[PDB]
Amino acid sequence: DTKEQRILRYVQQNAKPGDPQSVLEAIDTYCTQKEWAMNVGDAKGQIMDAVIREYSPSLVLELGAYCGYSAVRMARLLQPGARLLTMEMNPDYAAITQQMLNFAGLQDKVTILNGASQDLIPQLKKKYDVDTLDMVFLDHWKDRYLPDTLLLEKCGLLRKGTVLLADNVIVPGTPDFLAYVRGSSSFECTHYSSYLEYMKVVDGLEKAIYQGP
Ligand SMILES: CCc1ncnc2c1ncn2[C@@H]1O[C@H](/C=C/CNC(=O)c2cc(-c3ccc(F)cc3)cc(O)c2O)[C@@H](O)[C@H]1O
Numbered sequence: 001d002t003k004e005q006r007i008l009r010y011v012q013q014n015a016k017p018g019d020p021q022s023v024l025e026a027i028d029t030y031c032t033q034k035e036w037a038m039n040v041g042d043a044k045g046q047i048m049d050a051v052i053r054e055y056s057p058s059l060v061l062e063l064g065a066y067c068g069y070s071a072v073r074m075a076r077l078l079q080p081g082a083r084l085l086t087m088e089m090n091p092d093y094a095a096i097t098q099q100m101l102n103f104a105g106l107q108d109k110v111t112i113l114n115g116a117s118q119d120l121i122p123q124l125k126k127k128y129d130v131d132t133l134d135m136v137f138l139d140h141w142k143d144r145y146l147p148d149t150l151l152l153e154k155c156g157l158l159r160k161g162t163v164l165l166a167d168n169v170i171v172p173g174t175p176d177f178l179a180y181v182r183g184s185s186s187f188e189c190t191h192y193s194s195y196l197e198y199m200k201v202v203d204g205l206e207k208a209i210y211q212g213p
């Protein structure tokens with residue numbers, strides 16, 4: 001099997017069904033003690049919690065679910081009736097994420113879309129009944145952050161005030177995206193310095209709030 005499957009099974013073996021904190025803690029312990037994995041992690045995760053609580057979004061889009069760590073983190077903090085859409089191209093990872101959300105008891109808050117973001121984004125309005133997004137969490141391949149930010153705009157999915165929150169803007173880094181939003185009158189940017197998951201290495205999140213066209 002794969003590292004991702006081993007993470008899920010360690011959650012199953014250890015955590016408590018219906019308890020999202022137990023799931024987060026299980027994943028973090030596995031990935032600290034056994035095998036590193038690219039989950040956002042607890043350090044950055046605490047910043048994400050603070051941002052999600054500040055804005056109280058009704059509709060969040062995540063790009064790159066992976067094993068569902070960040071989807072559990074965000075969905076647990078959504079107000080009742082608010083929703084998360086998460087896109088994941090890898091079918092195996094998409095199924096791991098769904099099972100992780102199911103185990104956490106958060107399945108009714110989250111829709112896992114198995115496909116490439118560039119294919120799914122244009123479908124959001126007609127197929128998933130989206131008007132505009134309140135928040136977008138970027139955590140997929142780093143060279144797709146800028147392409148997909150521009151595609152979101154083109155598709156009319158950003159409103160005045162939509163909060164973009166980008167992982168890994170220091171390591172591995174997303175240089176075209178970061179330079180773009182920081183240089184653009186269409187974004188208001190704030191940097192939250194933190195640490196790479198499971199490591200004593202500086203990373204950070206970028207918050208980039210869309211100002212309108
Ligand atoms: C095609 C568009 C598209 N559409 C839909 N789903 C997509 C997608 N592109 C990618 N996916 C999925 O997203 C996830 C990949 C995410 C990529 N993430 C990092 O590379 C990364 C690396 C480090 C790090 C590595 C090594 C180091 F030394 C240090 C840091 C730390 C981090 O937090 C990181 O996020 C997987 O589930 C993909 O299947």
Ligand SMILES: [Cl-]
Nearest residue numbers: 039040069070
């Ligand atoms: Cl994650």
Ligand SMILES: [Cl-]
Nearest residue numbers: 041042043198
């Ligand atoms: Cl961490």
Ligand SMILES: [Mg+2]
Nearest residue numbers: 040139167168
């Ligand atoms: Mg990341």
